[PDB]
Amino acid sequence: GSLLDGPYQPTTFNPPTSYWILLAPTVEGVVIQGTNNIDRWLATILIEPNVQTTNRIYNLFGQQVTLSVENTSQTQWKFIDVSKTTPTGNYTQHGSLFSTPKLYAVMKFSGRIYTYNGTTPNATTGYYSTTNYDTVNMTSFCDFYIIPRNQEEKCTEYINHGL
Numbered sequence: 726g727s728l729l730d731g732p733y734q735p736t737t738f739n740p741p742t743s744y745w746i747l748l749a750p751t752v753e754g755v756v757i758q759g760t761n762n763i764d765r766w767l768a769t770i771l772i773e774p775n776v777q778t779t780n781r782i783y784n785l786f787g788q789q790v791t792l793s794v795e796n797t798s799q800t801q802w803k804f805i806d807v808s809k810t811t812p813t814g815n816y817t818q819h820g821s822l823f824s825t826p827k828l829y830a831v832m833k834f835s836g837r838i839y840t841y842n843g844t845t846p847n848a849t850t851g852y853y854s855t856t857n858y859d860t861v862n863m864t865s866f867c868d869f870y871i872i873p874r875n876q877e878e879k880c881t882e883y884i885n886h887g888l
């Protein structure tokens with residue numbers, strides 16, 4: 726397709742602004758992480774269906790981090806954005822996406838990091854204001870595609886219905 730660049734392999738990269746990174750994860754764990762090394766350490770974790778409240782250890786920026794997670798859905802996987810604002814602080818959970826297609830997306834735009842939230846097939850976007858956002862390197866731990874912001878409606882379609 727001429728709309729979607731990829732797939733590309735798990736890697737560390739500094740994406741251009743105004744491009745969605747469409748992520749295609751497999752198993753539960755850390756999907757993608759990125760930081761500005763100032764006041765924003767961001768990551769997205771993935772929870773399989775049917776997970777009772779439990780502590781799980783995630784490797785975030787080379788560190789074992791214990792987070793209290795759950796997924797009450799029996800059919801949908803759960804993407805959760807995690808954020809800490811100081812090097813020595815705690816991660817809080819934001820902007821969950823309950824997903825049937827198991828796809829996620831992230832984008833750098835207007836001094837923010839955008840992601841998807843809600844429940845498929847009616848997902849919407851959300852964002853996190855990020856200092857010096859151009860320095861933000863990301864490490865994807867799964868295969869990904871690239872889609873221009875101009876084609877955001879198609880990205881939303883993929884989030885909601887799959888490829």
Ligand SMILES: CO[C@]1(C(=O)O)C[C@H](O)[C@@H](NC(=O)CO)[C@H]([C@H](O)[C@H](O)CO)O1
Nearest residue numbers: 808810819820842850851852853854855
């Ligand atoms: C300050 O306000 C904002 C932000 O502009 O960043 C608004 C944004 O909607 C919100 N997004 C969501 O909650 C989910 O997308 C985000 C977030 O709560 C914090 O950045 C977490 O530190 O806060």
Ligand code: NA
Nearest residue numbers: 820840841842
């Ligand atoms: Na989200």
